[PDB]
Design a protein around this ligand. Sequence first.
Ligand code: HEM
Ligand code: HEM
Lengths: 144, 144
Amino acid sequence: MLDQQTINIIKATVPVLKEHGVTITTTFFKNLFAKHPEVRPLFDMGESLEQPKALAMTVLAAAQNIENLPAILPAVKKIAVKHCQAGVAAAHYPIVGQELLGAIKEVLGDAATDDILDAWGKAYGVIADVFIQVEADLYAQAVE
Amino acid sequence: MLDQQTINIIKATVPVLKEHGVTITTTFFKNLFAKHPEVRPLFDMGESLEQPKALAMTVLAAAQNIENLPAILPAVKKIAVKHCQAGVAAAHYPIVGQELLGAIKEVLGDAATDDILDAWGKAYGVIADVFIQVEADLYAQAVE
Ligand code: HEM
Ligand code: HEM
């Protein structure tokens, strides 16, 4: 669980990140696909490489709700179904986290202190752990 | 969210409460029904007054998992269905919390420091909030 200052940072800064949403989203996907070619096949439907554009913004929405994560469970469950369909693994989450933080660092710029970036790293980890556990149980459910 | 000290108290003491499970369970239900006659109709099937004996022990099991509450979601969802079926309200949860804490105080006796009881109050609140939100979404889902 997160300490209070971590939560204060998330609550205080997420509106800034949301205001600059288009930059976060596009930087995130650019860096994800460029630096991690191994995940590109998961985003291949069917026709140029396709993107769930709300992915990063949905992390931010979860973070905004960091104190009432149960409230976002209906969204999580639906996304989790798509993840398990696509073959998302627990080991993917640190990769997504790394590139999200890179995008956050870009948007915040001079305002991107180590403590603030650390805070978002911790928040992402808590949010990812929710998806990871839900998806693990979904994977288990599929071979009942 | 809970602070680290609160969590550490929960982790350290929940095994003691589990060892004394039968006393917690029986004290809880005795006091619940005696002190809150208005909830008795919810435990009325049909033929003696009925008890989900695992109710308190399931709070303790959730507390054991306080750091990975997503792990208990498959159980929570199933219990939530039963709650919404029975007519459990958000306003009921503080009542159950009160009588659970009363039972904990009974079992711990000499060891029931104010800080330990406060920690269990906070932990219960977090756990109850999970059920409350899930059940609120279930209630809403029923009239879509
Ligand atoms: C960590 C938090 C994450 C969040 C909040 C998130 C959020 C989302 C959202 C909102 C969608 C679109 C769902 C829809 O409208 O159908 C999506 C789709 C997708 N995500 Fe995630 N995601 C996360 C992590 C990941 C990770 C680690 C991967 C690993 C590659 C991943 C891969 C995908 C893929 C492949 C799709 C497309 C599924 C499809 O095309 O049907 N996501 N995600
Ligand atoms: C975090 C708090 C709570 C937990 C962990 C919990 C847990 C449980 C469990 C394990 C059951 C048995 C489920 C089954 O095996 O079918 C149950 C049933 C029940 N609980 Fe809860 N409970 C909680 C709060 C409450 C509250 C606040 C009320 C308000 C009166 C309540 C009323 C009931 C009733 C009436 C049933 C019987 C359902 C049936 O007969 O189908 N519970 N609960």
